[PDB]
Design a protein around this ligand. Structure first.
Ligand code: SRM
Ligand code: SF4
Ligand SMILES: O=S([O-])[O-]
Ligand SMILES: [Cl-]
Ligand SMILES: [Cl-]
Ligand SMILES: [K+]
Length: 538
């Protein structure tokens, strides 16, 4: 490994970090777009204000502005639905640990309410909000409204640090290991430069996903994140062992491996910076299928890569890993849906199921209102695209169970619905091969009408190989494809995955059966359930 491989490939030129002209050969077109103009200048040099003034039809007539809206705007959290909702933008937040407020929730609703049939919102597999319908001339004013309610959307798409995921039961669970809200909160601020923008970590070769583990249940999915913080004592000090490189991609899925490093709790942020700088400095920037952090780790080796993190640390010490973490391997992951006692006596939380994560403006207002009336104005999102409303005086529960909105967003849905996860699909996503959200609900419904079960089978539905709905963690996973019916007609279909496990004994699922027409999945899934999961025919 020639020591010239270890040379930083980016420079801080003019407050922004850019590829050095010697390392700019044979790069992918997303590296070029970033070279041509720095994406952070759209927020940090307020250049959205004037881009927002150009008709969409004009913007498309020159490469430079077409890349503004189709590419660079993703650093502002805005994603052009070019194919399926032309001239409309999806918008994704920073919502560390998935904690929102009623007033944030109400503001998001008032933005999507405006767009009518073209608007709705969604809870994501990184316990985040997305809103849809957004038009460009509205961006400057939405940005201002987001800030006003204490939210940022910065650096949530493209080559950025994505939503910091944490324990959905942080601060409320008797059985928590460590409260992850400070650490995800700190990480988000670091990333976004306390909502101003942070160009030091805004030009990675590829997306990068952190989590901070606080549950024995491992609700955080540490195994599939580029950096996972595993609570662990070392030499009497509380800290985190570090796992690195977990990712999913059309080409390759790989679980996170130990860096062989521990940090004390106060080093969470500087080790995040060190790894990211290493990644940004040294990361490969050709073929996009070969750009995530694991590919660098495989080229340098784990000790190669580790030495590079160590030299970007303060004091340049990176302690070796504590041989055990605080996570109990004896643990049955817990159903958070329903009413549960909090550690603060007299109080309860409620997990409410949100069918495939999909909400309309009216829905968001109802949940905002339950949080205000029954809780403390707080709503928490989950990675299965559900909600928790914490801090409810247990004496209010009886009245809450009677609220009409709880027939739609239930604390006790049938067990297959409890764990159903589906990505956007082709209603809005231009990469999608199939419609996922409506389809998955319809299939799950007909399957559950047929069988009854005790084990909580988790079914994930994803619209294309990008696997945003993470079919490799599911008990039964469905990946969109096109296939053929008995007459050779093109029909939507799914590859069915099995074998995915979560919690400490985590495992990646693989395709069990390819190209099953979607209209044939009910009998197949019914049988799989009966034969493999203890389901009983009704
Ligand atoms: C919304 C969400 C799925 C959802 O219904 O929940 C989704 C959204 C899409 N992802 Fe994802 N990703 C989401 C979960 C993830 C995850 C799960 C996770 O993070 O744990 C995965 C797999 C895990 C991983 O990345 O390590 C993921 C895999 C990707 C990939 C494949 C990555 C790769 O290295 O090849 C793409 C395509 C790409 O990056 O080139 C992508 C790109 C896309 C885009 C941005 C593509 C596009 O612009 O059309 C999707 C936007 C569709 C839309 O309009 O909503 N999305 N995506 C999730 C939003 C997360 C967030 O709030 O930040
Ligand atoms: S898995 Fe594919 S279809 Fe689904 S949201 Fe991600 S990119 Fe779109
Ligand atoms: O956009 S995806 O990477 O969450
Ligand atoms: Cl993106
Ligand atoms: Cl598109
Ligand atoms: K859900």
């Amino acid at each position: 490994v020639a020591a010239e491989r270890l040379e930083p490939r980016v420079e801080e030129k003019d407050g922004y970090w850019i590829l050095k002209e010697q390392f700019r050969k044979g790069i992918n077109p997303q590296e070029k777009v970033k070279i041509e103009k720095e994406p952070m200048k759209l927020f940090m040099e307020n250049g959205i204000e004037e881009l927002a003034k150009i008709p969409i039809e004009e913007i498309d007539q020159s490469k430079l502005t077409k890349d503004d809206i189709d590419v660079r705007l993703k650093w502002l959290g805005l994603f052009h639905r070019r194919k399926n909702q032309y001239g409309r933008f999806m918008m994704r937040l920073k919502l560390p640990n998935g904690v929102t407020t009623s007033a944030q929730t109400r503001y998001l609703a008032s933005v999507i309410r405006k767009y009518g049939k073209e608007g709705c919102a969604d809870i994501t597999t990184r316990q985040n909000w997305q809103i849809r319908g957004v038009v460009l001339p509205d961006v400057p004013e939405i940005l201002k409204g987001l800030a006003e309610v204490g939210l940022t959307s910065l650096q949530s798409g493209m080559d950025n640090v994505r939503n910091p995921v944490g324990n959905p039961l942080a601060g409320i669970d008797p059985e928590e290991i460590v409260d992850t809200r400070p650490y995800t909160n700190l990480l988000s601020q670091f990333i976004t430069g306390n909502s101003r923008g942070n160009p030091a970590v805004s030009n990675l070769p590829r997306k990068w996903k952190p989590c901070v583990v606080g549950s024995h249940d491992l609700y955080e999915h540490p195994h599939i994140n580029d950096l996972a913080y595993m609570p662990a004592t070392k030499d009497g000090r509380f800290g985190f062992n570090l796992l690195v490189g977990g990712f999913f991609s059309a080409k390759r899925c790989d679980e996170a491996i130990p860096l062989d490093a521990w940090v004390p709790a106060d080093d969470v942020v500087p080790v995040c910076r060190a790894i990211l700088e290493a990644f940004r400095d040294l990361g490969f920037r050709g073929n996009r299928q070969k750009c995530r952090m694991m590919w660098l780790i495989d080229e340098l080796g784990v000790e190669g890569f580790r030495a590079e993190v160590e030299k970007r640390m303060p004091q340049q010490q990176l302690e070796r890993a504590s041989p055990e973490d605080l996570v109990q391997k004896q643990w049955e992951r817990r159903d958070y849906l329903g009413v549960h006692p909090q550690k603060q006596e007299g109080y309860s939380f409620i997990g409410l199921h949100i069918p495939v994560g999909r909400v309309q403006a009216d829905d968001m207002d109802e949940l905002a209102r339950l949080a205000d009336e029954y809780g403390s104005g707080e709503i928490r999102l989950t990675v299965e695209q559900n909600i928790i409303i914490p801090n409810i005086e247990t004496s209010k529960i009886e009245a809450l169970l009677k609220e009409p909105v709880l027939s739609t967003f239930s604390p006790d849905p049938p067990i297959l619905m409890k764990g159903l996860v589906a990505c956007t699909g082709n209603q809005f996503c231009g990469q999608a091969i199939i419609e996922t959200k409506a389809r998955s609900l319809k299939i799950t419904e007909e399957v559950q009408r047929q069988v009854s079960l005790t084990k909580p089978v988790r079914m994930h539905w994803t619209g294309c190989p990008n696997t945003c709905a993470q079919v490799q963690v599911a008990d039964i996973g469905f990946m969109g494809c096109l296939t053929r019916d008995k007459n050779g007609k093109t029909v939507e279909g799914a590859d069915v995955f099995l074998g995915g496990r979560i919690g400490s004994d985590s495992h990646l699922g693989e395709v069990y059966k390819k190209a099953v027409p979607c209209d044939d999945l009910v009998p197949l899934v019914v049988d799989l359930l009966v034969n493999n999961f203890g389901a009983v025919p009704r």
